[PDB]
Each structure stands twice: as C-alpha cells, then as structure tokens.
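From: lab user (bench 3)
To: helpdesk
Subject: output format question, protein + flavin mononucleotide

Hello, I'm new to running complex predictions and I'm not sure whether the block I got back is the full result or only part of it. Here's what I submitted:
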Amino acid sequence: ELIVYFSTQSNNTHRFVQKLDAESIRIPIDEEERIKVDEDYVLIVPTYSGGKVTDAGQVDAHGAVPKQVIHFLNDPDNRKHCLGVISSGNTNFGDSFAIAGPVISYKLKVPLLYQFELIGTKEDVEEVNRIISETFNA
Amino acid sequence: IVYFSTQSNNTHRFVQKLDAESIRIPIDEEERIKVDEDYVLIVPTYSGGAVPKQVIHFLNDPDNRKHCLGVISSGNTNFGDSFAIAGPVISYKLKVPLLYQFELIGTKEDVEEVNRIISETFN
Ligand SMILES: Cc1cc2nc3c(=O)[nH]c(=O)nc-3n(C[C@H](O)[C@H](O)[C@H](O)COP(=O)(O)O)c2cc1C
Ligand SMILES: Cc1cc2nc3c(=O)[nH]c(=O)nc-3n(C[C@H](O)[C@H](O)[C@H](O)COP(=O)(O)O)c2cc1C
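Helpdesk reply: Thanks, we reran it on our side. This is the complete output you should expect:
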C-alpha cells in the first residue's frame, strides 16, 4: 500500500494523509524538484482552480491540478503506476469542488475513488484506509 | 447495470453494447422504481443541476442508494469542464467510486473497458 500526495504550505492534504495507514510519498512544493516512484500508488491531490467559471457560466477547471502534480504525471514511469485518484478541496467552490480528481481520472483512465474536504473527517480517514486497502488487494 | 436515458437514447444504446444485464430508470418523472441487487450506475449529464431529476428521485430512496457499487457518467466533451459532471456529484454523495466516464453512445474502447471494469467491481 502506497500513497503519492501533493500539499501546499497550508498542509491540509498533508495533515489528512498523515492520519492514513498506508506509506506516503510527497510530491515536492518546489516546482524544480522532481520525484520518481517505482511502485503502484493511489494519488491524493487538492484542487486549485479557484472556482472559476466561463463567460457562459460553466466550470473553468484551468489550474485545478497543481503544476507540481502535472509535472509528476507527465513522466510515463510515474503515470503507469497510478491505480486511482482521490481529490480534495472545499465545497464552498460549488461545482468546482474537488475537480482535480475527475480531471486526472479521465486523462489517466483510472477510477476517482474518493473526494473529501480540507483535512478530512474521521469518517474520511476510515473510508480512504478501506478504499486504498481494497484497491491494493485487487 | 442500472441506467437512465432520455428520448435521444445515447446511454441506452451504449448499455445494450455491454455484456452485463441492465435495468432502466423510467423517463417519466412521477414513475419510480426499486432495485434489490447490487449495481453499477450509468447516467448522462444534464445542465440547464448536473444529475437528471429522475436519477435524483431514484437515489433519494434509501433502498436504491444502498445497492450502488459505483457510478459511470457520460456526456459530451464539447461542454468543456462541465463534461460528465453527474458522476463526480453522485460519487461524492453516495461515497462510491467514479469508475469511468464516456461520451455519447461510447466507442469500441469504452465498451471493452466498461465490460472489464464492471466484472472487477462485482466481487
Ligand atoms: C487559490 C486557491 C484556489 C482553490 N480552488 C479550489 C477549487 O477550485 N475547488 C476546490 O474544491 N477547492 C479549492 N481550494 C481549496 C483547497 O483545495 C483546499 O483548501 C485544500 O485543502 C488545500 O490543500 P493543501 O493545504 O494540501 O494545499 C482552493 C484554495 C486556494 C488557496
Ligand atoms: C439540455 C442538455 C444539456 C446537457 N448538458 C450537458 C453537460 O452539462 N455536460 C455534459 O457532459 N453533457 C451534457 N449534455 C450531453 C448529454 O449528456 C449527452 O448527449 C448524453 O449522451 C445524453 O444521453 P441520453 O441520450 O441517454 O439522454 C447535455 C445535453 C442536453 C440535451
């Protein structure tokens, strides 16, 4: 069991991932630093599009996936090991809530396993532990 | 499979190409159904509220909601970043995985991929 995650200096996603059972590897905040992951992982990432909309009024997802995660997933050696994605955010962004997940899910053709807010609740920790376990069992 | 499809019938035609057995949610909003076996939900996305009213009525019943193993959603990629957004909404509300997303009537790849995914889920 292995998690790859991203978290800005606000550390919300870090504090959620710290509570989970599985081992975790952090994608660096420093944009110039890169990592290489050798084993299969579930990806956990926050959303950063700012709840933008288009002139028509539909969701604008530009910047949903943090740039550091885009660089990470651009490497096919990293990308191939992704078993699924979990995304986070804040429901105050409405239809842009947690949209980094569906964006990544559709591009990689991997399931969007879960979505949560901020540092997560006790129930999120319980569900994600189970979900990650089941994914690695399968 | 449990699915919804309007008069345009795109989601219906995709589901008939799949190997698994399927049950249809009715188009008439007053008509409602009940399901007691585990199912993967497959629904299109309709904005002016991503989820069709008929699916909202279906999922509002606690007896239907408990049997969902996961959701697959569809739409049209020309809707930009509102593409297929019924799935994520349902996924988050039910706490079930969003397994796949596809366009319209689906491609050869979608048929094979959703066949594979549904088999892995039923375990
Ligand atoms: C500039 C900015 C833009 C954001 N945009 C979104 C968004 O589009 N959708 C969303 O659900 N959450 C959004 N959020 C909320 C964050 O994703 C959320 O606070 C998350 O917990 C931050 O994770 P981190 O502290 O690990 O970086 C945004 C936050 C900031 C600061
Ligand atoms: C009024 C209307 C609104 C729609 N809104 C969306 C949307 O917000 N996002 C999307 O991805 N597709 C949207 N679509 C495309 C449909 O979801 C797509 O054609 C789907 O295949 C319809 O399935 P059905 O023929 O089974 O009803 C819309 C279509 C119509 C007619």
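A quick orientation on your result: DSSP finds five helices and five strands in chain A. Let us know if anything else is unclear.
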